[PDB]
Amino acid sequence: LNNMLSQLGITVPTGTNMQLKNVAAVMVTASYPPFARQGQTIDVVVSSMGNAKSLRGGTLL
Amino acid sequence: NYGYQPLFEDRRPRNIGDTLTIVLQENVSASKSSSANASRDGKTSFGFDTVPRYLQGL
Numbered sequence A: 001l002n003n004m005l006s007q008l009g010i011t012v013p014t015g016t017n018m019q020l021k022n023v024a025a026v027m028v029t030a031s032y033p034p035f036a037r038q039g040q041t042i043d044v045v046v047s048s049m050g051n052a053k054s055l056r057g058g059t060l061l
Numbered sequence B: 001n002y003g004y005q006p007l008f009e010d011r012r013p014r015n016i017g018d019t020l021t022i023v024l025q026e027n028v029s030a031s032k033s034s035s036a037n038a039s040r041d042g043k044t045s046f047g048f049d050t051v052p053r054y055l056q057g058l
Helices: A002-008
Strands: A026-030 A044-048
Antiparallel strands (some): A026 A044
């Protein structure tokens, strides 16, 4: 999250308190199809990877 | 326009001209030693203080 914020233009000081609740770290997996052309779309699977309770209404960045 | 830049990946240097911090912490220490010694003593003696008569010839 700090990497993303820094990339966007906001530098959070280091060694500071930060406890979020609406964010989860996920692994995304997909299947590259045959003869795939750039611009097309595929379906992805999103899976939690640490101590999260649910991904009910989330959005993948 | 700069190229594609990831979002969650750490800021690592990737091309010519990027900067990177080095933390110089060097600490080397080597040593060696050896020795050797030797010794030898000797002391012999013999003395006939009072010789009997029948041995005076020897």
